[PDB]
Design a binder for these strands. Sequence first.
DNA 1: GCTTGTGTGGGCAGCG
DNA 2: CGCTGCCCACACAAGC
Length: 87
Amino acid sequence: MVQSCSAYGCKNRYDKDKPVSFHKFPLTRPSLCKEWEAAVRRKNFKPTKYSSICSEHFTPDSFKRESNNKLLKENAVPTIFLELVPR
DNA sequence: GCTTGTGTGGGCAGCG
DNA sequence: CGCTGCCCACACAAGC
């Protein structure tokens, strides 16, 4: 969301000082959308996929419509969400 | 090239 | 009081 991504505590709230854009889940690529679930391994699972996510969580390749045709790389999903657990 | 579709961008209510 | 769940309008890219 705007407040923060579905990651594990990514309070990366829109900060122009930080190089990130704000995208929505790959709604239209549900199967692939679903692995995002897996990377959102947070107990208190953040919003669904209508909320938005920021760029730092995926590979630049898979960023968005700039991928292959008009959406992500269907074989890529946010993997940069978080290392293990914040302190 | 312009219009339409999908992505982009952000919000409100109830309980620790 | 903030967070989670779901929706609309505009610009860019494709079609006519």
